[PDB]
């Protein structure tokens, strides 16, 4: 059973740096600045038809669209490379390029030198946005929701995906690569079950991931393949829809089909909850992982029916974090935390019922 | 003494007639010239000797008493001639077959007489008493032959008695049943009424009682016969005995006159106010003319003829006053000596008995066929009195009471006209070599009919004044072929228009509005207007498939065209579907046509060709239209799918069009705009320019839609190399306000010839056009990544080296503006 799109909203991400999101609709596309909450255009359903996928390049004019939903103008194997800033009579003039495969696109990932193709069972990367080139093709396990991140990095061009073996990583630096030649992509053994959702920080350092079980967030270090921290949402299995770093890489978030985002320290891991048999000193020698295992410093509550991406606002103060979640039900919520674990709603949208302010 | 010596004596007692020479009521007082004086008044055929044993118990009624003294008794026997006081008895009974037997076997010499007074026989085939009276002198059903001074030369040649009578006078034939209905006869003086030859009744010429009577009267006067009921009423009297109520003989009834004024009237008998048929008709003194032959059994074996001849009679038809007035034909025809004439033939054939070669052989098919005619060779009649009206008083008389008649005789008949030369009084006649045609009921099946016409004609000929004198350029013009295969269950009225003028020029517009064709659409036109009985007026429908083949048109007027010449070849407008409806389908498949241009706007132009140059001429042109007054919905839906439309041309000649043009609801083309070779050579393309204006966009989308808009060549260049403004190129895509571009791979490459010399071309443009104007948000973008190679200065030096402006909602141009929407800011590249 497909769920029907609630609200049209088929495809919800956060560009690059988070400060702005996309939204892929039954109506087209939609684009909103996150900090302050505001539309910055859309393309309509005229321009485009029903959209599966959108992904932004940064804050540019650069968007790869993908067709899906119920009245798509463009095929579901087709990459199209709108160009807002480009003067046209015809939606058409400001469609520069197109990537076409042989089997459905499951996600579009940007970088300013590069673009990321993924299918169920490979991923191709070109350069991009000048004079686009296949440059690698890689073979993945059944990716079905086509898990794949990009570091943002001018530093670092490391690409993360699921690893053959189940709930292995693969990592690779593309800098690193020849172009057509096989770097030997670096594996993690992540995970005993498939991944679910898996994020880079920005300087590309860690690795975050979790699995179908989604009761551990698993962080490794990308250059040692050390395992640094093993974080626990909670007891419970819970479908994970998003992870992400902070911009700083001091606090992880994490959204789940729980209808709640968790917020971990990553740097001071010490204002992770830890749990009560952990003061209770080592009676036994069975109970090792549980005590170990650090608990969400804060967390908030969302619509549960709703699936939700997370992100880390921009800093407001020395000592106040926010947090933003964007729901598939067309619901904005920022929050604001602090190092004490307090946790409070800062600002709640319904961000589809922004219209443009052509009143100034 | 009154010395009654004389009785019923021997003699052949005739079957109906019984011969008995009976002096009664007269005192026979007789007291080789031997005269003895008498009185044979009496002599009485009570005849009904055959019917019912004699008829004894009702003896006829028509008998003699006191009929003629004949006292003198001159001669004797021996030319036993007899100078009397009796005319003669007429035998009421049977004329045909009884009468004529008796009188056979009667007569099984060469004696003459000499009669007084032209008894009034009244044989119906007490009234035979009143002939007997008069020949002691001597409303209907008084058949009359009273000669009142008789000069009856009973010439009685008995040597099989090949007789003969000449008379000096004429008989009063009312001849009707056994309202003046009847023909009145009237000849009376010898010349006058020179009566010749009435009875035979003799085996010697035939061989009823095979007459063979050559009744060839031949006068030479007036002879008015005044009043003719009926033709019919005449054919069933003389076929059978008769058969009208209150309401091996070959007669040659050969009349020939210079004068004898005559009456005609149709006939329209109820067996098979007046008679609608040409209400008033006369062919007053006129030739005697109605010169017959017939017979006496019914339904003739051998065909029945009605001929007729005149000069230049004056016969009043239809009088008001006659449509035609005189035959006025001197159309001398053959090497030797001629002078033709008009004549009237009729062919009646038995009930039931047994585009030049086209229209011609179908309707001589169908004169083979006879249950009525009508024919006439007029050869330059075209007559018409000074009081008549083509336009009207023939379509009120003659189209209407023409076929409504009582068409059958013993309704499939024809028609048939002949003229050399034609007159349309009140007007272009133009009338050479015409006729008419018509036929009823083709083979026999009510419906099926062959309706024709032909001439040969000069095309357009104005009227008031002067002629405005058109065709100054095998077959024949106005051949308008119609054919009719209408259906009586269905009860409507069909046509199939074959029209076809060859070579015409069907213009009648002389004044700047319409005018003289006003006056041709208010005398032409009038659909077959038919209040006659059998025809309750059908719902009129018409489906033309008309071939206006080389219609040429060149003498269309306006304020102030310049000579124009506009050579069509083929005119196709087959409408094959109905024209009066809402929708009407018009293949108008035309077959290369052309145009050619005069020499100076201001009205007078002369040239060395007046078939000038070519200017706009067209391959083909299938403007399909559908009419809906392609499933399209909107009204009037003018689809004109033009194939294409080749255009050549010199800075002058374009020039000097334009000034012409100047001085003097989808519409959906999908058609190519021009293939233009366009002294200079320069071919520019403009392929399916799908121009459907007003197609939808809410208001007059008027999409230019260019598939293709390649400006194939410009300067002095003739090959194409790629100039811009599968493509697509809707430069002109409107809303209600809007434009585009086709983002093509390379537009501008201007390195041919001269990039101004369409400047220069502009310049001799406005040297020629004298008066040259022009000299939501837009968002007209050029949106074309330029691969170029003063502007035009700047294009030549560097011959990509430019950039699209995308002018998203700029509104630079207003129209005027345009300019200085292109003027914003500042680009340049490479």
């Known amino acids: 059973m497909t769920q029907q799109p609630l609200r049209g909203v088929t495809s919800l991400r956060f560009n690059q740096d988070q400060s702005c999101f996309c939204c892929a609709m039954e109506t087209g596309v939609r684009i909103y600045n996150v900090e302050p909450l505001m539309e910055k255009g859309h393309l309509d359903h005229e321009q485009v038809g029903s959209m599966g996928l959108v992904e932004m390049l940064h804050r540019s004019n650069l968007l790869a669209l993908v067709g899906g939903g119920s009245s798509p103008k463009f095929s579901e194997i ?84 699921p690893g053959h073996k189940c709930g292995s990583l693969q990592l690779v630096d593309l800098a690193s690569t020849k172009p057509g030649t096989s770097s030997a992509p670096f594996t993690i053994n992540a995970h005993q079950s498939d991944i679910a959702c898996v994020s880079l920080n920005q300087p590309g350092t860690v690795v975050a991931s979790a699995s179908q079980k989604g009761t551990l967030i698993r962080l490794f270090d990308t250059q040692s393949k050390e395992k640094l921290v093993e974080l626990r949402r909670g007891t419970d299995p819970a479908t994970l829809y998003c992870i992400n770093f902070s911009h700083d890489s001091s606090f992880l978030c994490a959204s789940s089909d729980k209808g709640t985002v968790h917020i971990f320290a990553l740097k001071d891991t010490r204002l992770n909850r830890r749990s009560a048999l952990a003061r209770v000193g080592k009676v036994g020698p069975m109970i090792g992982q549980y005590v170990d295992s650090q608990w969400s410093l804060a967390s908030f509550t969302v619509p549960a029916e709703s699936a939700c991406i997370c992100a880390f606002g921009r800093n407001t103060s020395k000592n106040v974090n926010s947090v933003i979640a964007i729901c598939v039900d067309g619901t904005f919520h920022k929050y604001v935390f602090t190092p004490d674990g307090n946790c409070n709603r800062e600002a709640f949208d319904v961000y589809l019922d922004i219209c443009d302010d052509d009143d100034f | 003494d009154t010395v009654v010596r004389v009785e019923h004596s021997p003699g052949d007692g005739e079957r109906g007639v019984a011969v008995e020479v009976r002096v009664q009521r007269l005192e026979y007082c007789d007291e080789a010239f031997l005269h003895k004086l008498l009185q044979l008044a009496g002599v009485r055929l009570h005849y009904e000797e055959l019917p019912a044993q004699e008829e004894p118990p009702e003896p006829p009624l028509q008998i003699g008493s006191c009929s003629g003294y004949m006292e003198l008794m001159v001669k004797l026997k021996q030319k036993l001639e007899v100078a009397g006081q009796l005319g003669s008895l007429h035998l009421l009974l049977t004329p045909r077959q009884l009468q004529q037997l008796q009188e056979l076997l009667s007569a099984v010499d060469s004696l003459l007489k000499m009669t007084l007074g032209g008894v009034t026989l009244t044989l119906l085939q007490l009234a035979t008493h009143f002939f007997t009276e008069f020949d002691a002198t001597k409303p209907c059903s008084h058949v009359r032959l009273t000669g009142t ?26 001849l009707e049943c056994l309202e003046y209905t009847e023909i009145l006869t009237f000849p009376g003086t010898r010349p006058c009424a020179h009566l010749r030859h009435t009875q035979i009744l003799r085996r ?167 249950r009525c005619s009508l024919e006439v060779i007029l050869p330059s009649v075209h007559i018409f009195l000074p009081s008549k009206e083509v336009y009207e008083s023939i379509y009120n008389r003659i189209n209407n009471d023409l076929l409504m008649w009582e068409p059958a005789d013993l309704s499939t008949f024809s028609t048939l006209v002949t003229v050399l030369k034609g007159r349309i009084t009140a007007l272009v006649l133009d009338m ?16 099926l009919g062959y309706f024709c016409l032909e001439a040969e004609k000069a095309t357009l000929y104005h009227r008031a004044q002067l002629a405005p004198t058109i065709y100054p350029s095998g077959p024949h013009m106005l051949s308008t072929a119609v054919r009719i295969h209408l259906d009586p269950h269905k009860n409507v009225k069909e046509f199939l228009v074959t029209l076809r003028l060859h070579k015409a020029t069907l213009r009648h517009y002389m004044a700047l509005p319409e005018q003289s064709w006003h006056s041709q659409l208010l005398e032409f036109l009038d659909v077959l207007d038919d ?72 009205v007078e132009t002369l040239d060395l060709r007046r078939d000038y140059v070519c200017v706009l ?46 001085y003097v609801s989808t519409r959906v083309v999908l058609r190519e705009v021009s293939l233009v070779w366009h002294h200079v050579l320069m071919e520019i393309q403009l392929s399916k320019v799908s121009f459907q204006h007003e197609v939808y966009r809410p208001l007059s989308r008027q999409v230019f839609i260019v598939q293709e808009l390649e400006v194939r060549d410009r300067l002095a260049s003739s090959q194409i190399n790629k100039f811009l403004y599968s493509n697509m190129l809707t430069i002109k895509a409107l809303h209600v306000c809007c434009l585009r571009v086709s983002l093509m791979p390379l537009r501008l490459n201007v390195d041919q010839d ?73 680009w340049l590249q490479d």
Request: charged share 20%.
């Open chain 2, 432 to 447: 050479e070599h015409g006729t008419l045609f018509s036929v009823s009921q083709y083979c026999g099946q009510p419906g």
């Open chain 2, 531 to 602: 209040p006659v009985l059998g025809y309750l007026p059908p719902t009129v429908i018409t489906i033309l498939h008309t071939h206006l083949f080389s219609c040429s048109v060149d003498y269309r007027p306006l304020y102030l065209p310049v000579r124009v010449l506009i050579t069509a070849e083929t005119f196709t407008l087959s409408s094959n579907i109905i024209m009066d409806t809402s929708t009407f389908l018009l293949r108008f498949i035309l077959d290369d046509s052309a145009l050619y241009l005069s020499d100076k706007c201001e």
């Open chain 1, 78 to 161: 087709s990459v199209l490379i709108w160009d807002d800033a480009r003067e046209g009579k015809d939606s058409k003039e400001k469609l520069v390029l197109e990537f076409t495969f042989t089997k459905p696109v499951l996600s579009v990932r940007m970088r300013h030198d590069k673009i990321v193709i993924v299918l169920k069972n490979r991923i191709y990367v070109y350069s991009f946005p000048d004079n686009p080139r296949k440059l690698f093709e890689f073979d993945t396990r059944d990716n079905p929701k086509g898990l794949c991140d990009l570091c943002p990095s001018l530093e670092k061009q490391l690409l993360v995906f």
């Open chain 2, 204 to 370: 010697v010429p035939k061989s009823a009682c095979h007459c063979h009577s050559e009744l060839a009267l031949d006068l030479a006067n007036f002879q008015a016969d005044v009043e003719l009921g009926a033709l019919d009423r005449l054919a069933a009297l003389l076929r059978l005995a008769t058969v009208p109520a209150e309401p091996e003989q070959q007669t040659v009834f050969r009349l020939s006159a210079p004068r004898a004024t005559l009456r005609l009237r149709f006939p329209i008998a109820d067996l098979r106010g007046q008679a609608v048929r040409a209400e008033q008709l006369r062919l007053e003194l006129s030739e005697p003319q109605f010169r017959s032959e017939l017979s006496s059994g019914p339904g003739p074996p051998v065909p029945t003829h009605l001929e007729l001849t005149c000069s230049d009679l004056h016969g009043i038809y239809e009088d008001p006053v006659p449509c035609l007035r005189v035959s006025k034909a001197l159309d001398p025809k053959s090497t030797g000596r001629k002078y033709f004439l008009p004549q009237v033939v009729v062919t009646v054939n038995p009930q039931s008995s047994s585009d030049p070669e086209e229209m011609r052989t179908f309707q001589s098919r169908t004169l083979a066929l006879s």
């Open chain 2, 149 to 174: 001074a008789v000069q009856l030369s009973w010439e009685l040649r008995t040597g099989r008695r090949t007789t003969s009578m000449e008379v000096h006078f004429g008989q009063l034939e009312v």
């Open chain 2, 754 to 826: 001269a990039l101004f010399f369409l400047k220069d071309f502009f310049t001799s443009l406005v040297a020629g056009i004298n008066p040259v104007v022009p000299g939501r948000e837009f968002r007209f973008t050029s949106e074309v990544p330029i691969w170029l190679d003063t502007f035009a200065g700047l294009l030549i030096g560097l011959a990509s080296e430019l950039k699209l402006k995308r002018l998203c909602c700029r509104h630079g141009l207003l129209g005027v503006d345009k300019v200085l929407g292109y003027a914003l800011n500042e």
């Open chain 2, 617 to 662: 001429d067209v391959d083909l042109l299938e403007l399909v239209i559908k009419t809906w007054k392609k499933l399209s919905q909107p009204l009037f839906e003018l689809r004109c799918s033009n194939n294409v439309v080749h255009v050549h041309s010199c800075a002058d000649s374009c020039a000097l069009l334009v000034n012409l043009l100047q």
